[PDB]
Structures are given as C-alpha cells and as structure tokens.
Paper text:
Nitrogenase catalyzes the ATP-dependent reduction of dinitrogen to ammonia during the process of biological nitrogen fixation that is essential for sustaining life. The Fe-protein mediates ATP-dependent electron transfer (ET) through its [4Fe:4S] cluster to the intermediate [8Fe:7S] P-cluster in the [name]-protein; the electrons are subsequently shuttled to a [7Fe:1Mo:9S:1C]-R-homocitrate metallocluster, the FeMo-cofactor, within the active site of the [name]-protein. The active site FeMo-cofactor contains a [7Fe:1Mo:9S:1C] metallocluster coordinated with an R-homocitrate (HCA) molecule.
A resulting 2.37 Å resolution structure of MoFeAlkaline-inactivated demonstrates that HCA is lost from the active site under these conditions. In contrast, the MoFeAlkaline-inactivated [name] structure exhibited asymmetric disorder within one α-subunit, which likely stems from the averaging of heterogeneous intermediate states. This poor density corresponds to residues 1–48, 354–360, 376–416, and 423–425, which lack traceable density in the more disjointed α-subunit (2.37 Å resolution). In the MoFeAlkaline-inactivated structure, both P-cluster ligands and one FeMo-cofactor appear well ordered, but within the active site of the disordered α-subunit, the density corresponding to the crystallographic location of FeMo-cofactor appears distorted. The disordered active site clearly lacks density for HCA, while the ordered active site shows reduced density at the HCA coordination site. Within both αβ dimers of the MoFeAlkaline-inactivated state, Phe α300 experiences a rotamer rearrangement with respect to the MoFeAs-isolated and MoFeAlkaline states. The movement of this bulky side chain within the disordered dimer is coupled with altered positioning of three histidines, His α274, His α362, and His α451, towards a coordination site for an unidentified ligand ~8 Å from the terminal Fe1 of the FeMo-cofactor. In addition, while density around the FeMo-cofactor is poorly resolved, a rearrangement of the His α442 loop that normally ligates the FeMo-cofactor can be partially traced into smoothed maps and may also participate in this coordination in a tetrahedral fashion. Given the nature of the density and the geometry of the coordination, the bound ligand could be metal. Interestingly, the Trp α253 flip is observed in both α-subunits in MoFeAlkaline-inactivated, where previously it was observed only in one subunit under turnover conditions.
Author numbering:
A (entry chain C): 48 to 353, 361 to 375, 417 to 422, 426 to 480
B (entry chain D), C (entry chain B): 2 to 523
D (entry chain A): 4 to 480
The structure:
C-alpha cells in the first residue's frame, strides 16, 4: 500500500499538483490559485472537480478560473521568479477583491531551481496579502497523497496560524469545523444543514465552499469533523497538538451511518445537543424511510464491487463484494457491459451525503443499475 | 428535505429555504465576504473599457487559456495508428490529465501509459523508467507499436529519448525490431497542435528515414492525407468519404476515428482501426501528401518535402465552400480523377442552404476562438455567409498566421470590423465581448463561463455560445459532428442559423410584450 | 426613429418608447380592451384543472389541430415519382395552400397544379375543368405522369375521376397511353396520411391491376419499400443506405428525396429523381413489400396483399433500437442477405451513446404529438431510453392504434404514467401540459405557442419544445434530419440529451444564485 | 428590352400553350405604355385561371379569413368545414397585433369545425351551434365570432346565417357569417369583397345610434393596412405625430370596437385600395366620410402622402406635417447615403397580389433601382389603371401569371432582383437571381414609413449583394 506505480501501466493516480491544487487549495473560493509552470496542468484541471461554492466568479470567487504563468522556453531557461512577481502584481491589479493568493508549483518549477518562497514572502510583505507557496511538483511522491500532505503543510505554515494572537472572535461551546469535505455536488452543504439542525455552529468549512477566513477561524472551534481522513489527518493532528482541539471522523453516507455519526457527534456535547440530534433523526426518519421503500425493492440483492460507502449500499438492500454494479476506468467497465457509477468522484450528479443526498444516491443507483441500455448490448441476430 | 416522488438534485435542492438560510448564515458569520454592493461595483468595473485596457496590458499573467500542452496532441496523434499505445515519458499526473480530458470530450476509453518518473528520476534521469515502462507496456497491453512523447519534467532534465530507447532495445527490455517512434514534445513550446506535429513527424521519420532508397514518388497511385490535431470523427469520415466518391486512392495517416468510436457490445476493444505500419512505410511512394491543417503541420511539411520529395500543395483547411472547392480541385489535379456529379450536387445543396439562410445569417457579429486552422476556416466560412467575425482569438496562433487571416479578412467586405488576436486568452475575449458586444460566440465549452458573465450584466448584454471546437464537455456526442467539406459547412450553417432563430424565439416569447414577433414561420 | 448604423427590425423597433406610447394610446382609447387583471384571471383559469375538464368535454369545436387534409398527403405521394405532376381536381386555393405549406417546410419549390373549379363547376361538375387542365398541364410542364387527387369541393359534388379521365382520353385532350392515375382524397375523411395512402394505392392499381397475369412473386430479387407520408429526406436516405449496405435489392416506391433537395447551380429543375414507371410496373415481381409506416398504409396493404399476393410482414416503423433490429432481421429473412458488420457496429455505437446519455435521459417526462407511426416509434424509443412519455397525443389516430400504443406502454415500466389521446387537438395538449407538467414537449412548430403559454405562467412552469415532426417552420434545414434506423435514433437521442443539457445550463446561468451547478462537465 | 422585343418575347412564351390557353393568356400579358389611362385597351384582368397551369392565386376563403377577418384580434374566427383550410392558413400571415393569445386575442389560433363525413352528409348547422356554445364556454373574453365558410359549406346547403342570427340573439354576441367558400369567384378578390360586405352588414353599423363617442376634427381611420410586420404601426406613428387621432385601424392589429367606431371618423385613409374600396365607398355613401389612398412606401411617397393628408385639415396639421418631415429627413437621408450606392442601376421584376406591385415602386426608385416587370394575381382593371402610370415605358405587365410564363420572362429578361411570394422564392433562388418575399417581407419589416424604409433598404442590400449569389457555378464546371 502507498508504493510506487509500475512504469508503463495505466492508472488513475494523479500527481502532487492534482492533490494540492485540485483537492485542497482549489476549492478555496476567495483565493486566487496560480498554476505556476506551463499551461497544460492548469488547463486540464480547470473546473474538473465539482467543488461547489457560492460566489461571483471572476470578482470575489475564482474556483472555476484558470490562473497560470504559462511558462515558455525563456521562463524555463532563465527562471520565472520575475515573471511570478509581475504576475502577482497583475493579479492584484485585475482582481482586487481576492483575499489571498496561492502558488501551486508544477513540475518544471522544482527542476529549474526557482525560489517561489522568497517571491511569496517579498510580495506578501509588499502588498499586505497572504501568498502561500506550495511545492506541489507533480513528480514528487507517487500519487496525490503527497500532494495532500504538502498542501496541508502549506495551510499550516501560511494560513492556519494567522489569528493565533487574535481573540476578537466570539466562541460558543458548540463550535465545530468541517475539515476535508470538498463539497462535491454540495456534499458539505448537506452535512452542514444536519449539523446546524443539531444546534451546532459550523464556524469553519473547507476546502469545499471554503474561504480563507474560515481556515483562519478553524483553530477557534471546539470540535473538528474530518470527512476525508487521508487528506486532512496531518492538519487534524496538528490542531489537536497545538490548539488542543479534538477531532473525529464523521460518516454521512446512508441513513444508518448518518444517524450513527450524528449521535456520536452529539455525544461530544451537552444534553441539549443530544436532544436536538434525536429531533433531527426523528424529523428525517420518514423521508429516508420512504426513499428506502421506493428504491430498496428495485435494488435488493444486487452485488456491488467497490466503512464509508458500504452503509448506503446496505441500506438499499445491496450486497457489497458477476457484479451488477462497480463503485478513466468508467468507460472501460462501461464497454464490458457492467453498469458503473462513481461513488466518490462522480462528475455529474449529487450530493450523495446526508439524508437529502441519500435520496439522490438511491435514485442514481436505481437509474444506472436498472437502465434498459445494459440489456441491449447483444444484437438479436448475434 | 426531499420528496421521494420528486427528488431534487443539487439544483434546485440548494435553492430550498432552509439551505438558503444556512448558506446566508455561513456567509454572514464566517466567510468575511465583501459587501454585495462592492461586488457589483467591481463586476461593473470589469466590463468597462478601462478594465479592458488594464487586461490587455498583461505580460506575465494568463487567465483562462485557450490551449493545451504538446503531449496531449502527441497522444492524440499516437492514438491514430493501428494497435499503438501512446507512451508519455515523464510524470504520471500528465497522463492522468490527458486521459481525463480525452474521455470527457469523446466519452470513450482513452489508452495512454506513463513510466511514472519521480523524485529520483529528477536526479539520474528516466533511463530505468523508460526500460521498465517499455517492457511492462509491451507485456501487459501487447501493442504493435509504442509511440513515445515527453512531459515537461523529462524535457527540463534533458532525457535523451533516442538513447534511452536504444539502451532499452540493447539490454533486452524490448525487441530490437519493435517499432518505438519517439518525439520530444516540450509543454513550454507551442501547444497541443505542436505536439501532434512533433509526434507525427517522429513516427514518419522512424518509419521512412532509413529506407528512402527504394522509394519512387507516385508509385502506389495514392495521396497521403495528414489530418493534424482533429477532435471531430466526422472530419475523418468526411475526408475518407469524399476521397472514396472521387475514386482517389488515399492513405489517411494517423486515423483515430475507429478507436474513438468503438461500439458497446459487451466487450472492451483496446485498439480499433488506425493507420497500419505498412501504410506509413509506403507513404513516400504516394503521388503527394496533403496536409489538412497546414498551420500546425510545419515540421511535418518540412520532413515530407525534404525526405519524401513530395510537392505538398499550398492548400487551406478544406473548410467552407471555396476552400472545399480548392481542396477537391487539387485532389483532382494530383490524382487525375475528375470530381464526380455527387460532389457537385452536394456543393449545390450547400449553396442552396446558404441562399435559404442568408437573410438570417447576414450581418451577424461573431466572436470566435480555437486552433489556428479551424479558426481561419471558420472565419472564411463566416465571410462566405455574409457574417462579421468581429473578434478572432487564437491563443496558439503566430504572426504569420495572423497575417494570413488578415489577408483573408481584407479580401472580404465583411472583415472590416474584424480584429485578430494571438497570444490572448479567454479573459481578454471576455473583455472584448463586454466592450464590443458580438451577437454570438463560437468556441469550446469554456466560453460558457463568459456567457454567464455577460448574462450577469443583463439579458440585453448576454452573448450566447455556440459549441464548435475542442473541448466540448457540457454537451453529448457533439464530437461526432463534421466541420470539413460541404457536409461540415452544412452542419455549421444549420447550427449557426438555428442558434440565431432560437435566440430570436427566446427574445420574443414574452406574451403581450414581445410575442408580436413570435412568428410561426421563420 | 432608426439609427442607420444599427437598424432595428420589428423586434425590437416596436419596443421603443414612442411606439410603446402609441400602442398604449391605441389600446386605451379605441380598443376597449378588457382590464389586464381580468385577462390575468382568465389566463390563470385556463391553466387550471377545471378548465381542462371543460376543454376535454368539447364535441364540436377543434382548436389548433395537429393534422392536415388528404390531398396534401396525396400531393406528397405524387411528388415521389419520376417526372410526375401532382394534379388536384378541385379549387385552386387548396393547391396554393399545399404548395405554401410544403415550401415553408422544405424550403424548396413544390410543383402542383389545379384545374381551378369554380361556381359553374359546382352545378355541372368539373369534367371540362379536368379535360382542359390535363391538356394544359401536359402541354406546359411536360410530365411523364399526372397523378390526380381531389379537393373537398369535387368530393362533395361527386365528380367521377375515372370517367372524367377516360373522357379526356377519348376526346383527345391527352394521349390514351399517357399515365393518369387518380385517387379520391376526401378532406373530411382521415388526414394527410390517409391521402398519401389513397394516392399510392391509386398509382399502384393504375400500374399493376390489369397486368397481373405475367407477374411472379420474387422474380426480380427485390423488396418493395413503401415509406408513407415522410417529410424527413434523411429517412429515405437512411433506408436506401441500410438496404444497400446489406446487399439487398430494393425498389423504393414514391421516393421524393431528389426533387425535394435539388441543388442550387443556376437552373430550376421541376423534376428530379423519383420512382420510375418501370419500378411500379415491376413491383408485383418483388419478393415482398415492406410498409415503413403501416398504420396509415392500410389500403395499400390490402391492395398489395390482395393483388400482388405479397405476404406483407408485420413490422413496426423502423424507429429506435428494437424496431430497427426487427426491420433489419425481417429484411435479412426476406432477401436472404445477412446483416453486415457495419450495421452491427452502427447498432453498437447507438447503444454506446445510449449508455453515455442514460444518466441525463432517465426519468424525463415528455408530451409528444404527431402522426401515428411516428408517434409510436418515438414512444418506443423513449421507453428504450428510460424516459416517460406522460402525454401521447395523436389527432389523427384511431382506436386500434391507441390499443397498440397502450400495449407498448404496458410492456415497459416507464410507460406507467403514460396516457394516449386520439382525436384531441393542441388546445387539449396545452391543458394537459399545464395540469400535468412534463419536462419537455416533442412536436412540430405549432407547439412553440404552447411553450409561450407555459412561460406566461412562469419560468418554472415553462415546457420547452423539441421540434421533431411535421411541419417545422421556425427552424432551417431540420427536414434534412433522420428519424429512422440507428442513424435516426442517434440523431434523436442527441437532440433530446442536448435539449435537456441546454435547459439545465439556462436554469443554472444565474451568477451567485444558481451557478453553483453551472458545471463545465456534463 | 424594346417594346417589339417584349412583344416577341410574349409571343414566344405563349407558343407552347394550347389554342384556348394561349388565346386566353395573350390578353393577360402586355407591354406598358404610361400614356394610356384605360388599361382595358391593353390588358384583361379578374378572369378565371386556366386549369392546370400552376397559378399562384388563392381562394375566397384566403381573401376573407386570411386577409380581412383573421387580423381582428379580439374576435374568434371559425374555419367552418374540414380541417385543411384552417390548418394551412394558421399564423401564415404576419398580421402583427398586441394581445394575450388564447385569452383576449386569437389571431394565430386555428378554430375549426373539423368536418367529418357525417357533417357532410347531414349538414353542420347543429355542429356550428354546439361549436359556438363551446367557444363561449372556453373563450369568454372573445368580443365576437366570425364564421368563415370553406368549400363544402356552400355545396351541402348549410344555412350559417340563421345559426349566426339565433346564436347571436341567444348570447348577445356579434356572430358574422361569411360565405367565403373557396370555389366562389376566381381569386382572393371576391373573398375581399365578401368579407367587406360581411363587415358592412354585421359590424360596421353597430354604433349607428350611439353618440357617446367623443369626436375631434382630426379623426382618421386606417383601412386596408394589415400590419404585416408592423407596417400599420409605423404608419400610425407618423399619422399621430402629425396631430391626427387614429380612431380605427383594421384589420391589422384591429379590434371589433375600432371597426364599430370607424363611422365616427372624419377621414378614411385606405392603404390597400383593392381589398377595402367597397367598404370605403359604402362609408362615403352612408356616413359621408371622405376616403383617399395613401402610400407610405419610401421616403418620397411617404412625404407626398403625409402632405396630401395634412392638406385635408387645418394649418396646424400642415405645420405638424412639415415638422415630422423635417424630423425624419436626416434618418432616411442617411439610409439613402448608406444604401443607394450599393443599389444604383439594378433592375427589379415584381409579382404580388393586388396592391404592392404598384405601391412599392417609389421606394425602389428612392434607392436607385428601376422596375422593368410587374403583375398581379387578382387585381382589377382599376389597379392596372393606377399601375401603368407608375411603371416605366416598355415594361412588362402580367396578370395571373403562370409558373412557366414568369419563369420564361425572368429567363429572357435577367433582372437583378425579383419580388414575389414563397411559391416562387426558391424557384428563382435556384436560378441564381436574388429574391425578396414581397408578401411577408421575408419574415422582416415593417417596410412602411421611414423606419420601414430603413429596414427595406437594409434587406434589399443584404439580399442583392449577398456573396451566395456568386457561388452557384462550381469552379470546376
Ligand atoms: C471600497 C472597497 C473597499 C472595501 C473595504 O475594504 N472596506 C473596509 C473593510 C471593512 N468592511 C466594510 C469590509 C467591514 C466593516 O467594518 C463593516 S462596519 O465597520 O462594522 O460598518 C474598494 C476596494 C476594492 C475597490 C475597487 C477596485 O479597486 C476596482 C476598481 C478600481 C478603480 O480604480 C475604482 C473603482 C473600483 C471598482 C474600486 C472601488 C472601491 O474603491 C473598492 C470596491
Ligand atoms: S480527498 Fe481524495 S480521487 Fe478523500 S485525492 Fe481524490 S474529493 Fe477521490 S475518492 Mo478524486 S481520497 Fe477526495 C478524493 Fe477521495 S480528488 Fe476527490 S474524488 S474523498
Ligand atoms: S390585402 Fe391583398 S397577396 Fe391588399 S390578398 Fe394578399 S397584406 Fe398581397 S399585394 Mo399577400 S391585395 Fe394585402 C395582399 Fe395585397 S396577403 Fe397581402 S401581401 S396589400
Ligand atoms: S505531473 Fe502534475 S499534471 Fe503533469 S506537468 Fe507535472 S504538475 Fe503538471 Fe503539465 S504542462 Fe503538460 S500536463 Fe504535464 S506535460 Fe507538463
Ligand atoms: S379553395 Fe379555399 S383552401 Fe381550398 S377547401 Fe376551398 S375554402 Fe379551403 Fe380545405 S380541407 Fe383541404 S385545403 Fe381544400 S381539400 Fe378542402
Ligand atoms: Fe462512448
Ligand atoms: Fe432550399
């Protein structure tokens, strides 16, 4: 596990830049993220992931935008630090409402000896703006895991401690942060509505629909709720060690896991939060019960080849393991005749988390698994 | 909340009152958002001419580019050969992005491998990566040919592709007879079309350089067709169909239409169709080589003219009436085959559609962008239709291509209000369509965002987008369309005129307000 | 007032303030218009279920029909034969309307003549009109054939076509050997498809009834194809292409695709292509006859089975995957030719697009209308796509056709919420889409008005229209599309999925309001 | 072409016709002589079409329902008979109007009795009464009903007049029976006459005893303008800028109340003389209302007509007319400066229904274009009397021209532009000659007034100078 990829074999694994720019930093909406290097890396990742956010794109939000230094031969030969400084000045000129800048390094940045840290410090002092250099060169590591680690280190070193000596924020005993939820199709919103219906206050939610001020406010919360453990465990343990903030993993995939996680989260607070959790569970019971009643008979006994995701499949009467469904590879299984659905990287539908997301998940599973198109692969004359 | 009978996706579920209240609380309490009046002020400022002047003063910052990197084009070129596996020497994330891009555009499996060069290879090079990757690829996927390109990492550290492949063959990792053409495709030079050109030149050189002694020009009575970077299967199909109608022997080199349109019959086909190695070997024996997209096939033209001794005709992309006519006439002259009556009837039918739609098409203002050859063909066809291509943007265009497009525009009275931009991105085009509003935009799916911006200024300022080009991500099966020949011209004409009519229908749907012009007959 | 630099057509010239004030003064001073609140109240009432109950109680009034009269279909059938003039015995206003209708649909010249029966012929018949018209038509337009239909006037007064043509031949107005097939096409019976059936039966009877002695079934190794009332030239083309790919000899009787798609090359061609008289004469010698649209070719079926002794197969319209498969298998069985690999690959590619777009197509609710065979083929294809055809309307359908469509719907889980309406017009459908809102409408250009009405209730109540059928007046060159076979299924699927995606893009274009779901990749 | 050339051409085209057809068609083709004031000496019109010759004439139903009655927005018009006639004429004419369709306006809707075999055999009067009841039930805001007869109505012995009377008395609603059966007459002209008679008999005199309407000395009605693409609005804005009050404007954007108020106006301004001369003469005879023809096609004709209209009123109206002319002079002067250089010396052949073949000449001359051929589908001899003074010397005049006749005329004349209907548009587009639809304005317009002149000049330039006309010959052929 977590070893080097065999050369010459196809694989889904991205690079460190994909794990840093595409996952951790890109969803931050009020910041501008410069893909430092040639044009390709920024072009292919532009609006590739559905990290949903609320904002005015191009004015105060920049998630779906592509900011790049567009490296040429002269930038490779003579470096791009002067180009980086000029680009930062131009970004300040043309996008005055940005609340910060991150510089995500592509591969040639780590090979030509460019010092983006010094440029970041100098320009941040000059413009009184947070400029975060991220050394997420794609060749670093073996997958996006090192990209997540480098991006988390950048968050810790440049953003997280910005309000360490600030006490103006008024805190409540029910302060929680949502860490590692990237709001794929609005997953983080579906989780946050349930959390606030419990009486909890979600002070911070990042990266998905996340702002830099929320990241700075994260060290002020009472509890951290980590959705994606493998991409945010470093920052969670850092916050536990430095600020003494406990963290826990929450699983809002399927009604059973959602109920269990809500009760576990309420167990970390007083009795009022527990009573509110019981109220939320009672309120949402009929809705997911109706969803199960409608869709479970259509999905009972179906085998899925893929815990986090097992709960929702089992809530629909589906067996998890000739698979009837499998949770770049999508089209390969599609052409083999097996219905396929992305259970954690879906590019079209959502959300799937929470009680509202469970209805969409059940509808999508019934739609894909029971579609007549899978019954027509063989010509009647063959 | 959700109703089981009517389930809401993210839209419009998050428009519910409770979600609205939660989002408002999140924004007001912790996001530290700018006031909405300030946001409106800045947005209005971004639509002004002062902001356009600031935007066009950019030297270091690129915003929303309209181009990709060379290895993407190299992979697309490699996919056009029979049982050929695209192989990108360098980092794995590049191949992941290439495959994701091509899957999203074509909605088909896309085969590509990497040797997964890592931090260690950044010091000692990727020789071992090359050997292991070639061996593993040949053992696992059994290709008849491995076409090798490079990522920016391999080009920066100066990996010698030729020496690495020779060492791999010498030490038994791959057989000495296995065809492994290679091309250096630096992503900091040119764009994806440059990568296509480099890969095609590498493959042609690999198969023809050392065996030119027994080659006689015109001995096989065929015409070589190099399509260039092409993402419409209909273009390959229309070129093949037009040449078959003419009775012209042809060899379409780098033909990927088969592998990008595999049927769904319960079986996954890794390879399908493509140019065979025999056709590449026999290519110097053709009468001539026709480059469909000459403005990004310059290295290919140099190799074909210098090595194959083929008198490559000075032909524009066969786009629109006049250029399709010129391409057909040149093919007739080269092959000696007269243009058949079927092609004449197709041309006449295109002219008939032009005369039927000229009233709605005349005077319409278009901003447009894409690759150089496609952009100039679209401009030529728009000028043939009586349209005005006011904003012509080509990120990967050069000065000579700009001069050629300016010459094309000056030859028409409808190119008077036209300006050609090279090295500009889609933020520049956003400023242009705000300060000098065209009737429509023509480009890939990214332009949709520009449309959104225009709609934010007002319905009267909205510039609708017409999706012709690469990549198209928000529509399905548009990659099966045709842009070349009379068939492509007919498809483009239908798309343009029906977009105009759809916009008019939308603008006149208001009952008792604008529906006096909601005409049944248009 | 007009600016010479930017001239405004009626829209938005009449949106100017001076024109607005002039219209307001005209309305307030002299029109005695109902108060706007009363108008809004009446509109809201018309959108309700009580209004639908009153609307469906209609027995004598028809509002916005979805059908034409028989001689229009008779003219379309006559246009499919070589050098054949449609000749409508009756009043000239009918022919003017037929020609205008077909001109607006096809955007091509439509040749048709009338004998101009007037008040005098209302008391003596149109025998002299028939003689003079036949002589003048033959002398002026030089046709090889004159195919005679009737208007409602000649049907009411009881003009005997057979006796009139025989007398015209007897007194020497036309040569006795000149082919003059006739058909009674009463406009108060059936619809335009009935007229097509009547005209085709008349022509076939004229050419084959009295020469059946020397006819042997299956002596020319051909399959007769009767397309019926067809207004998509792509359908003729796809049928011919699929039959030629299979290597099957065929005779497409009443083929108008050439005369309806003549090129623009400087000359006018009154006649082009068409079924030859030898084809109709040799039709009884075919292996069998296949009716592409059996539900309006019943008289033709009776004649072919009774006279030609052809065992006409029980085939649905070759629309969609299953029915195209059935048509191809039946053709293979009749001709003995195996289905080639190209058609198998085409079917697989259609299935591939179905798999690609099923996520966006599944569960979508459609209200569709048109002719019986087209409607049922569309319903079958929508069921194959996982769509729900909630409102199925066929103004010219019958009880047997409704029973067949209900049987089709009961065989699919996606036809559970589907209702079939026969004899109902587009006012009924407007009530249906107001009370039971579907996601989309599918039909001809008339449905655009329904869309307008829905938008008047609100943007959330708007039902967008997808223009598939006849006639399409507000879009250009849609008559060149295909609805038959795998190619037609692919075109229909692309249109449907891209309409859904366009609607989703329009609904999510609102910046900071709904653009969180304005996804680049769909 | 000289006069002898035109005469020889006419003979050569008539050569192919049979003796009866050739003899009849000879009297309908002529060479213009502007000095002749009696067109009966050179051309014969308003005669029956020759059978089987591909004519362009419509029927009486088209001239009544499609032209005169259909544009009345607040009325519901029933195409009485089989479905075809109503279906083909639905929304095919661009009579622009303001209203909420299906609630208070019904112009683009198709109301029909949808006659079946039983209705033919046993009549349709009971079905007509039931249909009227259903119309009242489902469209309560309709201000009147017209019943336009199709061909079978007059042949099966149906009595729609009695049904109209009974239902109108029962529902207190104006029900106008129009016997516009298509076989009546020879063209749409008799349809115009029948519709005008129906207007006079059932609608026009409704407010004869009503004096509650307040009249002013500057009260005018616009008769015969059907608002094709907004033409009537562009004329009405010019008329009202002149100080006149346009009380009535029918049929285009017309309401039944305006028709009822027409007898109260001081002047009648007739745009289409052919379709409304009957009602204009009746109003002059009965209410003593003077009527006169105006031509707002092209700046010269528009200015002349505005001055002629202002001359019928006091000096204040003339001063306002001069003010309007001065205000609009720079606009049409700029339009001319832009488009006349691109249109100078281009020859035009026209063939439209009954008014436009002579009315639109002035605007063509305003742009520098000469008209060499003109003709009518259904015009009477008075229309040709007005036409010969407008057409140039030795120009071709054709009445009820056939497809072959006009095709040969175009082939042997070679004009730069042709203005006719949709049934010849693609015929002449395939011959490589630019074509402009002169009925619907090619889905453009308006063409009346100064704004209409700007649109007309832009359309003429865009069609005549379009590159598509230079590409009809393949470069290899
Ligand atoms: C006013 C606004 C600053 C907002 C701010 O920071 N307020 C202070 C921060 C405190 N608040 C208001 C955000 C919270 C509070 O404190 C509320 S309270 O104190 O409790 O009342 C500044 C910052 C960015 C500026 C625009 C951009 O340059 C682009 C453009 C350049 C042109 O040359 C002139 C026009 C443009 C539109 C500028 C206008 C304006 O000049 C903007 C919006
Ligand atoms: S971070 Fe990870 S690959 Fe946990 S790198 Fe990847 S937005 Fe996936 S299964 Mo893309 S460990 Fe997130 C992921 Fe999961 S980018 Fe997203 S979908 S829940
Ligand atoms: S009514 Fe007549 S055919 Fe005078 S039936 Fe026809 S809207 Fe024409 S030349 Mo269409 S006598 Fe009007 C006419 Fe002229 S429909 Fe219009 S354009 S000025
Ligand atoms: S592993 Fe990752 S995505 Fe790859 S380069 Fe490296 S940071 Fe970037 Fe970039 S421009 Fe194209 S796509 Fe590459 S070859 Fe370079
Ligand atoms: S001349 Fe005129 S348009 Fe002709 S019928 Fe007569 S009123 Fe009508 Fe009607 S339904 Fe069809 S189109 Fe006729 S055959 Fe009868
Ligand atoms: Fe696919
Ligand atoms: Fe045409």
């Amino acid at each position: 596990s977590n070893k080097k990829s065999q050369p010459g074999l196809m694989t889904i694994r991205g690079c460190a830049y994909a794990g840093s720019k595409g996952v951790v930093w890109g969803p931050i909406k009020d910041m501008i993220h410069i893909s430092h290097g040639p044009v390709g890396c920024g072009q292919y990742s532009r609006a590739g992931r559905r990290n949903y956010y609320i904002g005015t794109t191009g004015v105060n939000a920049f998630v779906t935008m592509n900011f790049t230094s567009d490296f040429q031969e002269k930038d490779i030969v003579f470096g791009g630090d002067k180009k980086l400084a000029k680009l930062i000045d131009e970004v300040e000129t043309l996008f005055p409402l940005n609340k910060g800048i991150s510089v995500q390094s592509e591969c040639p940045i780590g090979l030509i000896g460019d010092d983006i840290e010094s440029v970041s410090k100098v320009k941040g002092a000059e413009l009184s703006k947070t400029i975060v250099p991220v050394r997420c060169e794609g060749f670093r590591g073996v997958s996006q895991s090192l990209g997540h680690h480098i991006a988390n280190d950048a968050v810790r070193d440049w953003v997280l401690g910005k309000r360490d000596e600030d006490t103006t924020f008024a805190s409540t005993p029910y302060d929680v942060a949502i860490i590692g939820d990237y709001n794929i199709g609005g997953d983080a919103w579906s989780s946050r509505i349930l959390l606030e219906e419990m009486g909890l206050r979600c002070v911070a939610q990042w990266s998905g629909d996340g702002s830099i001020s929320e990241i700075e406010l994260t060290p002020k919360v009472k509890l951290n709720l980590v959705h994606c453990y493998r991409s945010m465990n470093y920052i969670s343990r850092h916050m536990e060690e430095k600020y003494g903030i406990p963290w826990m993993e929450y699983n809002f995939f399927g009604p059973t896991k959602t109920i269990e996680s809500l009760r576990a989260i309420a167990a970390k607070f007083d009795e009022s939060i527990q009573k509110k959790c019981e109220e939320v569970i009672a309120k949402y019971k009929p809705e997911w019960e109706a969803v199960v009643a409608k869709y479970r008979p259509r999905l009972e006994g179906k085998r899925v080849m893929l815990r986090h995701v097992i709960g929702a499949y089992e809530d629909l009467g589906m067996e998890v393991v000739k698979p009837d469904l499998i949770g770049k590879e999508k089209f390969i299984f599609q052409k083999m005749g097996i219905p396929f659905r992305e259970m954690h990287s879906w590019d079209y539908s959502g959300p799937y988390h929470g009680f509202d997301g469970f209805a969409i998940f059940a509808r999508d599973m019934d739609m894909t698994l029971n579609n007549p198109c899978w019954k027509k692969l063989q010509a009647p004359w063959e | 909340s959700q109703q089981v009978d009517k389930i809401k996706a993210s839209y419009p579920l998050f428009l519910d009152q409770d979600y609205k209240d939660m989002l408002a609380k999140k924004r007001d309490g912790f996001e530290e958002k700018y006031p909405q009046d300030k946001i409106d002020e800045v947005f209005q400022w971004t639509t002004t001419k002062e902001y356009q002047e600031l935007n066009f003063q950019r030297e270091a910052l690129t915003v929303n580019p309209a181009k990709a990197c060379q290895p993407l084009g190299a992979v697309l070129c490699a996919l056009g050969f029979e049982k050929t596996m695209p192989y990108v020497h360098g980092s794995q994330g590049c191949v992941a992005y290439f495959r994701s891009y091509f899957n999203r555009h074509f909605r088909e499996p896309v085969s590509c491998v990497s040797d997964s060069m890592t931090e260690d290879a950044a010091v000692f090079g990727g020789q071992q990566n090359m050997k292991d990757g070639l061996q593993n690829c040949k053992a696992t996927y059994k290709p008849d040919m491995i076409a090798v390109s490079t990522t920016c990492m391999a080009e920066v550290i100066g990996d010698d592709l030729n020496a690495f492949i020779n060492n791999s063959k010498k030490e038994g990792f791959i057989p000495d007879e296995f065809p492994v053409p290679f091309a250096h495709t630096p992503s900091f030079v040119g764009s994806h079309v440059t990568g296509w050109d480099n890969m095609f030149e590498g493959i042609a050189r690999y198969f023809t350089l050392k065996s030119m002694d027994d080659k006689v020009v015109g001995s096989n009575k065929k015409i070589n067709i190099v399509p260039g970077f092409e993402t419409y299967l209909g273009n390959f199909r229309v070129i093949k169909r037009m040449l078959s109608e003419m009775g012209v022997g042809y060899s379409l080199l780098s033909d990927p239409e088969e592998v990008l349109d595999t049927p769904a019959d319960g079986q996954f086909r890794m390879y399908a169709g493509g140019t065979t190695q025999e056709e590449m070997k026999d290519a110097p024996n053709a009468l001539n080589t026709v480059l469909l997209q000459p403005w990004h096939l310059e290295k290919t033209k140099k190799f074909v003219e210098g090595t194959w001794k083929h008198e490559v005709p000075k032909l524009n992309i066969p786009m629109g009436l006049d250029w399709t006519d010129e391409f057909l006439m040149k093919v007739s002259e080269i092959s000696g085959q007269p243009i058949p009556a079927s092609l004449t009837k197709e041309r006449g039918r295109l002219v008939d559609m032009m005369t039927d739609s000229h009233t709605w098409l005349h005077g319409k203002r278009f901003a447009l962008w894409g690759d150089p050859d496609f952009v100039m063909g679209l401009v030529k066809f728009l000028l043939e239709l009586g349209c005005e291509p006011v904003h012509i943007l080509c990120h990967n265009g050069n000065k000579r291509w700009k001069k050629a497009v300016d010459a094309i525009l000056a030859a028409s009275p409808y190119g008077k209000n036209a300006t050609v931009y090279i090295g500009k991105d889609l933020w520049h085009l956003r400023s242009l369509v705000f300060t000098d509003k065209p009737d429509f935009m023509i480009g890939n799916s990214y332009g949709k965002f520009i449309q959104r911006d225009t709609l934010h200024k007002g319905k009267e300022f909205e510039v609708p987008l017409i999706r012709i080009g690469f990549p198209i991500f928000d529509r399905h099966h548009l990659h099966r369309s045709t842009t070349l020949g009379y068939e492509g011209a007919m498809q483009i004409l239908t798309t343009l005129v029906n977009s105009i009519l759809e916009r008019l229908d939308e603008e006149t749907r208001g009952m008792q307000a604008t529906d006096y012009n909601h005409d049944l007959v248009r």
